[PDB]
Design an enzyme around this catalytic site. Structure first.
Site, mmCIF file in Angstrom:
data_model
loop_
_atom_site.group_PDB
_atom_site.id
_atom_site.type_symbol
_atom_site.label_atom_id
_atom_site.label_comp_id
_atom_site.label_asym_id
_atom_site.label_seq_id
_atom_site.Cartn_x
_atom_site.Cartn_y
_atom_site.Cartn_z
ATOM 1 N N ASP A 18 46.899 29.103 27.825
ATOM 2 C CA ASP A 18 47.889 29.829 27.038
ATOM 3 C C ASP A 18 49.262 29.818 27.709
ATOM 4 O O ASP A 18 50.241 30.297 27.150
ATOM 5 C CB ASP A 18 47.431 31.259 26.779
ATOM 6 C CG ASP A 18 47.027 31.966 28.032
ATOM 7 O OD1 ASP A 18 47.729 31.842 29.028
ATOM 8 O OD2 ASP A 18 45.984 32.635 28.035
ATOM 9 N N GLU A 56 40.284 40.982 41.689
ATOM 10 C CA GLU A 56 41.367 40.408 40.908
ATOM 11 C C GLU A 56 42.493 39.864 41.785
ATOM 12 O O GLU A 56 43.026 38.777 41.522
ATOM 13 C CB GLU A 56 41.953 41.446 39.949
ATOM 14 C CG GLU A 56 41.120 41.745 38.698
ATOM 15 C CD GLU A 56 40.965 40.558 37.750
ATOM 16 O OE1 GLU A 56 41.681 39.555 37.885
ATOM 17 O OE2 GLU A 56 40.097 40.625 36.857
#
Lengths: 130, 130
Positions: B49, B35
């Site tokens: 978004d 990540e």
């Protein structure tokens, strides 16, 4: 805001919830207790469809309120979801009254089915003067 | 701060991450790895978004932290996204623990699913003395 049991009960009664669509005040209360613990500021994230559940009755941003960040969002209640995180629950009650108008009713809430349906719910309203 | 493999493994361990929610230290380490490359300053902007993922565990700004520039923000972890970019990962850890309290657990992260799930993850912790 975390309403005290009896305080929420008289308020929902005052807001015309008892017997609304055949739903007793004790069932509304049982729903509120398991959805949010009577806390207007409660929320939950649904990662599968990117929706969030808001308020005392945990109303979803995907069909009921607009939070501007949920794909496929319908705003049947025609209100911002933030309005359901306020101490004043008038808007939430009006939206909850819309939810149970759908051909699914109060069974729309899963936790109600699991914790309130067919069970004794008198404790939720015991000695509140309602 | 970009941690070295074992230094992070030991920190996560002292912060009580091993076995938390059924997730082994090794799986948390594999998550950190793919990540953020173990970098506390890593950020990932999503044009879709328009939200941003912050730090070692890449926690998203839509529901978890507040960065002041994400409308409709729900700050479920009760903290500014900036606190998730610091060298001390205590708050990042606390916030990560909250995220995995959800049903799917660590499977909430796309990268963990792509890179860690169903795979031998013992590589990330070997040699670390934990």
């Amino acid at each position: 805001k975390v309403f005290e049991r009896c305080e929420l009960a008289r308020t929902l009664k005052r807001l015309g919830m008892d017997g609304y669509r055949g739903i007793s005040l004790a069932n509304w209360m049982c729903l509120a207790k398991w959805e949010s613990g009577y806390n207007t500021r409660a929320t939950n994230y649904n990662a599968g469809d990117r929706s969030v559940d808001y308020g005392i009755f945990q109303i979803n941003s995907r069909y009921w309120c607009n939070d501007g960040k949920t794909p496929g969002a319908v705003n049947a209640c025609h209100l911002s979801c933030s309005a359901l995180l306020q101490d004043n629950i008038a808007d939430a009650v009006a939206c909850a009254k819309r939810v149970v108008r759908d051909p699914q009713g109060i069974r729309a809430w899963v936790a109600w089915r699991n914790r309130c349906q067919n069970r004794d719910v008198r404790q939720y309203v015991q000695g509140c003067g309602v």
